[PDB]
């Protein structure tokens, strides 16, 4: 029961819960995209997109403030390295029992989740046939559904970001 599994457990700390699931989703998505890289190439995906109605340009707001128009593999590389960095950052994601979560942690996590969604969107829009080819649709669908149930639970991604898969989300 996913709706149940995403709720804030008995006397748990919100930040820790979100931190803990965010790490897991990154891993899920990394795995899933990892499986179809052979089919996501600079040739197939010249610009990063969620179908022709949505095109994404990479910026992290610090090192790169002016969005770069790039291919899907490149955009996702930018993205995955970027998320990794954050998760490895001890001021951001404390693994010790001494560092608290920064005052802005929620905003940090929301930003990671916002962008992780785009990998799902690109996969569903552009590579679902490959996903079926490799017989990983069940893995993809359950992962996405889990991801969405969690963000809906804590209102972590706003509707206009989710729009490229609104129809798919509605059928969850």
């Amino acid at each position: 029961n996913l709706r149940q599994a995403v709720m804030l457990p008995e006397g748990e700390d919100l930040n820790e819960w979100i931190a803990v699931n965010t790490v897991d989703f990154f891993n899920q998505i990394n795995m899933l995209y990892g499986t179809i890289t052979e089919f996501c190439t600079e040739a197939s995906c010249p610009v990063m997109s969620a179908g022709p109605r949505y095109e994404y340009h990479w910026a992290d707001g610090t090192n790169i403030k002016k969005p770069i128009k790039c291919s899907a593999p490149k955009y996702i590389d930018y993205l995955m390295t970027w998320v990794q960095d954050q998760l490895d950052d001890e001021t951001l994601f404390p693994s010790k029992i001494g560092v608290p979560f920064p005052k802005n942690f929620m905003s940090v996590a929301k930003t990671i989740l916002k962008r992780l969604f785009r990998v799902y969107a690109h996969i569903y829009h552009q590579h679902f046939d490959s996903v079926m080819q490799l017989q990983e649709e069940a893995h993809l669908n359950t992962s996405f559904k889990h991801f969405i149930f969690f963000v809906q639970e804590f209102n972590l991604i706003d509707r206009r970001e989710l729009a490229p898969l609104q129809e798919l989300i509605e059928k969850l």
């Binding site: 949505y54 095109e55 994404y56 340009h57 002016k66 969005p67 970001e161």
Partner: peptide
Amino acid sequence: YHSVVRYA
């Protein structure tokens, strides 16, 4: 700057 460009 806007990271997402929408088209119709």
